[PDB]
Amino acid sequence: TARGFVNITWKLQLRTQFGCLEGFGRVVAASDALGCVKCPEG
Amino acid sequence: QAQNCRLLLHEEATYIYRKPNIPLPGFGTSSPSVPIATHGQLLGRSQAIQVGTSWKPVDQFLGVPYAAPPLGEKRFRAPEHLNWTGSWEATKPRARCWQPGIRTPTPPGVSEDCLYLNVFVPQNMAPNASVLVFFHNAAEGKGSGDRPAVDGSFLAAVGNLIVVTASYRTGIFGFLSSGSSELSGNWGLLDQVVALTWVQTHIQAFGGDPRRVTLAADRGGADIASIHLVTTRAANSRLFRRAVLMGGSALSPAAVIRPERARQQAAALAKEVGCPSSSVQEMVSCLRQEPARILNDAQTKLLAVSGPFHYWGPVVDGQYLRETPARVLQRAPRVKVDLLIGSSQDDGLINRAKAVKQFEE
Amino acid sequence: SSQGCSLFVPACTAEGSYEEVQCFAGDCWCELAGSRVRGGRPRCPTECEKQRARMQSLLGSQPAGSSLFVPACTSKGNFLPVQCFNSECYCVDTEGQPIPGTRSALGEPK
Amino acid sequence: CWCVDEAGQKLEVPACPGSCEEVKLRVLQFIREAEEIVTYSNSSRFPLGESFLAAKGIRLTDEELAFPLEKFLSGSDYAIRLAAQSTFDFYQRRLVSAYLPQCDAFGGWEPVQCHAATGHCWCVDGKGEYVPARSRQIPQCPTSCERLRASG
Amino acid sequence: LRPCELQRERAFLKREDYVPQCAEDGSFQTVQCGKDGASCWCVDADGREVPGSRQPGRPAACLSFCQLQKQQILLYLPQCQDSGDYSPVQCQCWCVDAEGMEVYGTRQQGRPARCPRSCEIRNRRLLHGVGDRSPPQCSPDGAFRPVQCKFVNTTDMMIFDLVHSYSRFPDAFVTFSSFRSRFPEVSGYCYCADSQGRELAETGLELLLDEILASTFAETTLYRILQRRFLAVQLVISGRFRCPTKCEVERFAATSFRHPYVPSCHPDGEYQAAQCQQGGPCWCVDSRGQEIPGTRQQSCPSERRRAFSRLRFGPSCPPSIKELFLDSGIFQPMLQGVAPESLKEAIRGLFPSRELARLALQFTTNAKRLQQNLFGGRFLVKVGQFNLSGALGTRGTFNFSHFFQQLGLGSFGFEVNLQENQNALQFLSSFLELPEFLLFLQHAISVPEDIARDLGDVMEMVFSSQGCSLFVPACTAEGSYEEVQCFAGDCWCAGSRVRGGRPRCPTECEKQRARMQSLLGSQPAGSSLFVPACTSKGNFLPVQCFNSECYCVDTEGQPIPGTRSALGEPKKCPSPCQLQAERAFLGTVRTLYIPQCSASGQWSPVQCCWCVDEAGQKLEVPACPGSCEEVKLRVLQFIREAEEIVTYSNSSRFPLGESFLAAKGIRLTDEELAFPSRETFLEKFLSGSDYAIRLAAQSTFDFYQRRLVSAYLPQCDAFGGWEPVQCHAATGHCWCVDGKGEYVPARSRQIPQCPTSCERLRASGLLSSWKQAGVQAEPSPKDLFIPTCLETGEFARLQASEAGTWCVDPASGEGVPPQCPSLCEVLQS
Amino acid sequence: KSLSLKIMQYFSNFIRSGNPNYPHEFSRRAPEFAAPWPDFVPRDGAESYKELSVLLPNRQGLKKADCSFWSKYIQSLKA
Amino acid sequence: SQGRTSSKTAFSQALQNSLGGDAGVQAAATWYYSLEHDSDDXASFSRALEQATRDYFIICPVIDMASHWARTVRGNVFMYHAPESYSHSSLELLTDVLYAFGLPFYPAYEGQFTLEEKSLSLKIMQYFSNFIRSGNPNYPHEFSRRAPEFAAPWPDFVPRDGAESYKELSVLLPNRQGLKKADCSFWSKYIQSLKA
Ligand SMILES: *[C@@H]1O[C@H](CO)[C@@H](O[C@@H]2O[C@H](CO)[C@@H](O)[C@H](O)[C@H]2NC(C)=O)[C@H](O)[C@H]1NC(C)=O
Ligand SMILES: *[C@@H]1O[C@H](CO)[C@@H](O)[C@H](O)[C@H]1NC(C)=O
Ligand SMILES: *[C@@H]1O[C@H](CO)[C@@H](O)[C@H](O)[C@H]1NC(C)=O
Ligand SMILES: *[C@@H]1O[C@H](CO)[C@@H](O)[C@H](O)[C@H]1NC(C)=O
Ligand SMILES: *[C@@H]1O[C@H](CO)[C@@H](O)[C@H](O)[C@H]1NC(C)=O
Ligand SMILES: *[C@@H]1O[C@H](CO)[C@@H](O)[C@H](O)[C@H]1NC(C)=O
Ligand SMILES: *[C@@H]1O[C@H](CO)[C@@H](O)[C@H](O)[C@H]1NC(C)=O
């Protein structure tokens, strides 16, 4: 990080495979659209 | 297309609760029998107005008196509280004032008893709504007995405010002064400062707020209206917070007529109709007998700008107005009155006398 | 004939017949004044707009305080449904001609 | 027969679109026009000079060229968009988008409109007119009546 | 002081060959340096040097204190913010100051929602009883107010306690009259304070309180008056209505300590965009001073990108601030009566917060009276002429003696331009008693806080919009908004939009001409100043005169030494070719192309080799074409371009639509489309021009003619000279031209015969005696001759005149170096 | 009908707040229906007003030439 | 050079000398040209006073004479106006005498005049030579009405308010109409009436 930045991942909250914030959990949508609903009380 | 209202909030919130508006005693039905104190019920009517595709119900109290009908011996003297009682049928626009150049025979709905103010209050709105006392003398043609000349329901609805549309007597009837101690005055300016105390007192009965009145006035009658921005009231009871003068100002050349001009500007009238212009007491006591038709065929004759061009306006009388408006405006401000002043290019001293020329022809 | 009057080519309709809307280099005008619209296309003045402009120009001659008929046109250019002159309004057809009947006075729903 | 909008203007039983679907057929037609350009270029029966010359409003008539563009002659922003879509496509899809509104099943505008790609999901009234951002929780906005009721 | 300054001060006095550079906050700079920038080694807060760093130069962004303390533990872990500094709350989930040692009472199970700033701790730490009993004035965000003010008991010189006196006697502070009647022997004392609240050096200014409900005394009108006076006195001292900023304290300290890295800043106060350490690398820097992660060694491309998105959407300036401030005269009179800086900060010192300006503008109702209320009198005007020095000012810590010893009777490295400060302070005075100012506050208060944090930032964004469809800007390398933007035929460089052709940028000459013309409008009538004259293209005219003294000028309008003759006498001064020669000589030996000019001064035909026209402009041993051969090569190249277009289309290599985009100047770039000659073709159309239209028309005609199943090239003689009679070669209307292709005044019979270059010239010289020079150097009226033409048309070999005869070449009436050279003989050389 | 509905809001904001741009005297949210109505300041540099035309554009110097004749010259001639 | 320069007295004196030398005419001119004689800045007072003196002395009388020469017909009239040119001070000659006499072509002033100026001067020299020869700048011979080719025709000055044309001695040499209608209307009608 001292330079302004083994497995290194630079995940940006809003190559380059989309994901989502942990606790939401992605959807069958693989890689494109809308995805990663908020996980319900279940 | 459609009017889309929505609240303003200082910051997001989860639950938002709004308390519904409770109509004041009298409203809610389609005959809003408003009880105004020390008189009784003042029952008007309701009408639904369309602006976009959406309608707003607006209560309309057309023809609410604010002064005894200046007929007969109450002609060239200041107005006074009508002292009515019981139930007023404020559901039909009333007769409009006599104006220069009224086509003969006198058309329907023109008479000296023209001191009536229409009130247009939307159905239900905020507790302390604002008011707009628009001083407008309807023209000869506008108005069909069912509807007022300037409806004002449409400004009331798209502003959520009350719109009082007062009329007032103008011409000789309003302003036949003689600069002297016996007949000087601006009766039409004294009876449009009585349509503002009425709005001061009995507008709480409607949804209005006495502290937010807004004295407006149109072409030519905004030189008369703007004399309130320079007259000194008691200064404890202001009669308006703002002023929307459309087409005039206190500073115009003819905003007030000089006494020596006024004194002779009525001697011409008195001679013209046939009265003896020897002394005011004997002169005015003769005009008080002349029918309005004969007395308004005279002013239109004197008022044409190719011969005399006798314009009648607010004299200075010491009691109500004491100093010329140019000299009053030199003094320092005492109360901050906003102002939305303006004019139109279609205006013009010959356009306002349009009715007089058609009479001269 | 000299009255009035770079790399521009005019368009042509069938059998000569100078085409209405001539375009060039981002301009397009239908010449006649008040037609240059930079980008897009202009609309040829409808019959209404021609009568409006003529009557407006003729208005300048009339003495102040007097008025005459200046038909009002919609945004596209059609005559308004109702044309008033002086307290007497008549509903007009497409080319601004009064419809028989329907000549009520001003200030009453029609 | 055919069907027109409430102004009477021609609209290309012939039951035909609602508030939005017509606004969507325009976008569908637009992409169709853009693809028509790319395939004409691929077939190569038009010169570049023709496109430019039309851009300047100097199209050539087949009457003076008996040997054998309405999109471009009118130098309108729609033509600019169409040409830009055409050229972007050609290069992109030779070696190797347009916002069409989301609609409901009955042809009425869906309350919440999304750009479908890095979307800034605004929401529209019952006639597609936007009513007042890559934000989380793509906003929920009122249907046609929940807007009328909230106002009323 | 702090762990540093004690070490720092000691080194300076002792002269040890290293001074431990430490910034504001009295904390060691992460990257120290040696006595002469030889080897900058980076250290930690204690002052130890990291063993793995001694490199010469500047270490590449050495690790910050938080991590340099974090990784120590590994051989609780601090949570270092992205900037490398401690997070405000560590995590028992307590929170910490900006040094590492936790604030006292903050140990909690969960994260505190918000725990105090650097000031609120000092105030609370004052009630607990460690420090002099005078609470520092805290900014609402929690930081120290820039201008601290602590009263002083004039007797025995002990600070006047305020946590007690204000607590018990809060009414005494309602006004200055009340205060004096309760604590007569108190004389205020205002000073600037750094980020840590520590008193700055030699900036205290002991006011006088003799002649001039809230809480905390940091909101009472006493303070706000007592610091508006201090800032006013500072405007004279320093020139800016504010205390020295975080940058300037470091720069003054760096200049005073003469260490290698002296930070660079501009009177705005913010850190300069790029600070260049002397004796090593430079680098960009942010507002806080943190080096950008790598820059060791403007807004077009974003705007370009955004415009493209608006195209991608397919079919289907600040907000409301230009037409309330700039349109109406609520702003225009504000600047006129110095600098935006002195006007930016003259409304942070006044009205520190928007909730105050609202109060101020409702209790004044009188523009003239405003300056009386704010400063408790006519202070600042009394400050311009130094009437304060005896009235209010007093022995504090600024040494007005030394300040005046350089004057007639700077603070933090500020050069004192005393006349400008007196002008600037006066400017505020009239600006403050200005009726339009009250309206400005009424509007500046309204603007949403998100776009303007405070009234100071309100004012920039309205300065920034002083002037202020489907267009995409072009872009050069590294942003660099391109000079000439084209769209839909328009092309504008930015007061000149011209249709069609690509416009020309205003040369330096034209810019100077316009500036001096505008400055002429101010000058009184009958007086004049220098307005340099520019040629058609834009170059400076060879001779520039001012008044009876004319000096020939070089390329960029700089007088040449010598040649300063008086007006009205022939001045022969370097030809444009020789000026370009000297300019290129200087330019090309100053970086460590040569135009060589004919002896007469004109551009030599061959330049290098290659050949150019008489103006010296580049023209595509190489023999050069004649007057018409070049005009023919142009047409040949044009037909070649048209065929290139047709055979590009026949290759289906170019999208049908792109050629349209060029007409609208939206040629898109291959930086954003790296898939691909594509650019080369689009250069022809991009600048929508008559040439482009002609080329497109020719290409289309060719494509639709020769796909299934012209251009007038001029006729020329054997020597490249224009033929007298030019025919269109097909249904010809055979006009005839002069000796340089310029037409001189129909499918007629007997195609016209028109005179050669000399029969025309001889006929002219016979009819009207417009003779021709023989020597070209101020010929006497005898050196002139009427050309003698032999029969067929060419110039006679030998041309005579009353003064003598000379041999000329029959091609053109131009002499030759000498019997008499004949055509083939002159062509031999 | 659409221009009139932008001027019934300038004249209703004024009746309510005293400043046609803002409908509430305790909320300075800028207006969106039409362009801001600038306060009239008498300075000759710019004394803006509102041209009640279709676009509702602000202008300046209503009648500089003609109302300097009456206000400055003729008023002098009155003496 | 003599030392005495502008002062408070001069401001109200100069205006009086230049425009008066009357009391009502001065008020009218002071309003019309906004000559704030009290304002103590020669930079602006003088710049607004040169305009008044130019209108009164230099440019309206050369329109009054043109109109009176055309009306009570005394022969052709051709009016020209040479717009303000900021370039050539240090020549005590204005842009219509240093174009009508070929100042650009002088050997002394070589390199001081752009080729645009030299071409314009040549066109204007042709206009003035045509006038000197034939009496009508368009036609160089009084017995041949061939239209001029060098520049646009110079229209005869007819005093009708509908169109009273003149030639603007600028680079393009365009014809214009109504040289100074407002200001010379002021001076010729209002002030002249006010003289009585
Ligand atoms: C210089 O400052 C002195 C003292 O501050 C001024 O003297 C005061 O003047 C004001 C009004 O100008 C009076 O209200 C005070 O009573 C005066 N006080 C004293 C002690 O003299 C002085 O006016 C300022 N100006 C000059 C020119 O000296
Ligand atoms: C109204 O009635 C009251 C008595 O209640 C009386 O004193 C007053 O004079 C009356 N006003 C008029 C106009 O009669
Ligand atoms: C607002 O409304 C109530 C009645 O609903 C009125 O009594 C009150 O006085 C009004 N507000 C003020 C400040 O008067
Ligand atoms: C159309 O483009 C495609 C994609 O590059 C290409 O395969 C094909 O050859 C083109 N059409 C023809 C007839 O070449
Ligand atoms: C200031 O010093 C004197 C010294 O005797 C002290 O008594 C006095 O109380 C101090 N000032 C105040 C206001 O207390
Ligand atoms: C003020 O400046 C001079 C400059 O040398 C210094 O000697 C003197 O001690 C200073 N006076 C004070 C009170 O600091
Ligand atoms: C275009 O190409 C075809 C073959 O692909 C050829 O027969 C034709 O002559 C070419 N036309 C031109 C103008 O090059």
Q: How far is C60 from chain D (nearest CA, A)?
A: 35
From the CA of E393, the nearest ligand is 1
Distance from residue B83's CA to the centre of ligand 2 (Å): 6
Interface present between F and C (3 or more CB pairs within 8 Å): no
Kindly identify which residue of chain E lies nearest to residue C24, measuring between CA atoms: E489
Breaks in chain G follow which residues, C to N over 2.5 Å? Answer: 21
Residue E154 CA, closest ligand 5 atom number? 1
C-alpha–C-alpha distance, residues F44 and E336, integer Å: 13
Out of E523, E534, E536, the one facing G115 most closely (by C-beta) is E536
User: Chain F neighbours among G 10-39 (CB < 8 Å)?
Assistant: 27-28, 31
Kindly identify which residue of chain B lies nearest to residue F2, measuring between CA atoms: B52
Name the residue of D42, D90, D91, D92 to mutate for ligand 4: max ligand atoms within 8 A of Cβ: D42
Q: Do F48 and E327 touch (CB under 8 A)?
A: yes
One-letter amino acid for residue E149 of the chain: C
**SS3 of C23, please?**
strand
* Crossing angle of the two packed helices E221-238 and E367-375, in degrees rounded to 10: 90
Longest dimension (CA), chain C: 57
C-alpha–C-alpha distance, residues B66 and B84, integer Å: 10
C-alpha–C-alpha distance, residues E538 and E535, integer Å: 5
From the CA of B80, the nearest ligand is 2
- Secondary structure (DSSP) of A1-28: -TT------------------TTT---S
Kindly identify which residue of chain D lies nearest to residue A37, measuring between CA atoms: D137
Cβ-based contacts under 8 A for chains B and C: 16
Pocket residues: Cβ below 6 A from ligand 6: E 399, 401-402
Pairing of strands B214-217, B242-245: parallel
Kindly identify which residue of chain D lies nearest to residue C15, measuring between CA atoms: D63
Whether chain C has a CB inside 8 Å of the CB on E691: the answer is no
Cβ-based contacts under 8 A for chains E and F: 49
Nearest CA, atom 1, ligand 3: B128
Record the resolution, in angstroms. 3.3
What are the residue ranges of helices labelled H in G7-60?
Answer: 8-15, 24-32, 42-53
Give D127's contacts in chain B (Cβ within 8 Å): 1
- Residue of E763, E774, E768 lying closest to E805 (CA atoms): E774
From the CA of B209, the nearest ligand is 3
Distances E358 to E442, E597, G158 between C-alpha atoms, Å: 7, 73, 65
Residues E103 and E94: beta-carbon distance below 8 Å: yes
DSSP structural state of residue E412:
T
- Tokens for E652, please give them: 């289906």
Interface present between E and D (3 or more CB pairs within 8 Å): yes
Out of E323, E332, E445, the one facing F45 most closely (by C-beta) is E332
Whether chain E has a CB inside 8 Å of the CB on C7: the answer is yes
How many residues does this entry show for chain E? 829
- Secondary structure (DSSP) of B98-131: P-SSPPSSPPSSB-S---EEEEEEESS--SSB--
D94 lines ligand 4 (CB under 6 A): yes
- Secondary structure (DSSP) of F5-57: HHHHHHHHHHHHHSSTT-SBTTB-PPP-SS---------TT--EEE--STT--
Residues E6 and E19: beta-carbon distance below 8 Å: no
C-alpha–C-alpha distance, residues C21 and C12, integer Å: 10
Q: How far is B338 from chain F (nearest CA, A)?
A: 6
Residues E486 and E662: beta-carbon distance below 8 Å: no
The subunits that touch chain C, with at least 3 C-beta pairs less than 8 Å apart, are: B, D, E
Q: What is the spatial order of strands in the sheet that E610-612 belongs to? A: E606-607, E610-612, E618-619
Give E520's contacts in chain G (Cβ within 8 Å): 86
B30 lines ligand 3 (CB under 6 A): no
Kindly identify which residue of chain F lies nearest to residue E442, measuring between CA atoms: F28
C-alpha–C-alpha distance, residues E674 and B208, integer Å: 69
C-alpha–C-alpha distance, residues E440 and E331, integer Å: 7
- Secondary structure (DSSP) of E306-375: HHHHHHHT-----TT-IIIIITTTTSHHHH----HHHHHGGGTSSS-SHHHHHHHTTS---HHHHHHHHH
C-alpha–C-alpha distance, residues E605 and E747, integer Å: 39
Interface present between A and E (3 or more CB pairs within 8 Å): yes
C-alpha–C-alpha distance, residues E126 and E135, integer Å: 7
Residues E59 and E72: beta-carbon distance below 8 Å: no
Distance from residue B341's CA to the centre of ligand 3 (Å): 30
Whether chain B has a CB inside 8 Å of the CB on C87: the answer is yes
Interface present between A and B (3 or more CB pairs within 8 Å): no
- Secondary structure (DSSP) of D29-91: HHHHHHHHHHHHHHHT-S-HHHHHHHHTT-PPPTTS-----HHHHS--HHHHHHHHHHHHHHH
* Experimental determination approach used: cryo-EM
DSSP bridge pairs for E491: E486
Q: How far is E535 from chain C (nearest CA, A)?
A: 26
Q: How far is C64 from chain B (nearest CA, A)?
A: 7
What does residue G19 show for φ and ψ, rounded to 5 degrees?
A: -100, -25
Longest dimension (CA), chain F: 49
- Tokens for C12, please give them: 């042509």
Residues F34 and F6: beta-carbon distance below 8 Å: yes
Q: Do A14 and D138 touch (CB under 8 A)?
A: no
* Crossing angle of the two packed helices D21-43 and D77-95, in degrees rounded to 10: 60
E701 lines ligand 7 (CB under 6 A): no
Whether chain B has a CB inside 8 Å of the CB on C65: the answer is yes
Out of F8, F14, F29, the one facing B154 most closely (by C-beta) is F8
C-alpha–C-alpha distance, residues B343 and B244, integer Å: 11
C-alpha–C-alpha distance, residues C29 and C11, integer Å: 12
Nearest CA, atom 2, ligand 2: B83
Residues B31 and B40: beta-carbon distance below 8 Å: no
B21 lines ligand 3 (CB under 6 A): no
Out of B1, B5, B6, the one facing D127 most closely (by C-beta) is B1
Write out the H or E segment, with its range, that includes residue B187: helix B187-190
- Secondary structure (DSSP) of E667-718: PPPSSS-----HHHHHHHHHS--HHHHHHHHHHHHHHHHHTT----PPPB-T
Instruction: Work out the burial of residue E568: count CB atoms within 10 Å of its CB; fewer than 13 is exposed, 13-18 middle, 19 or more buried.
Output: middle
- Tokens for F33, please give them: 């229906």
Residues E474 and E485: beta-carbon distance below 8 Å: yes
- Residue of E154, E143, E169 lying closest to E222 (CA atoms): E169
One-letter amino acid for residue E74 of the chain: L
Kindly identify which residue of chain C lies nearest to residue D59, measuring between CA atoms: C11
Out of B141, B142, B351, the one facing C64 most closely (by C-beta) is B351
Q: Find tokens 């007038």 and name the residue.
A: E712
- Residue of E78, E414, E473 lying closest to E240 (CA atoms): E414
Whether chain F has a CB inside 8 Å of the CB on B214: the answer is yes
Whether chain C has a CB inside 8 Å of the CB on E498: the answer is no
Distance from residue B82's CA to the centre of ligand 2 (Å): 9
DSSP structural state of residue G191:
I
- Tokens for B242, please give them: 């703002």
Kindly identify which residue of chain C lies nearest to residue D78, measuring between CA atoms: C40
- Tokens for G148, please give them: 């001029």
- Residue of E74, E65, E128 lying closest to E97 (CA atoms): E65
E382 lines ligand 1 (CB under 6 A): yes
C-alpha–C-alpha distance, residues E437 and E370, integer Å: 10
C-alpha–C-alpha distance, residues G188 and B153, integer Å: 57
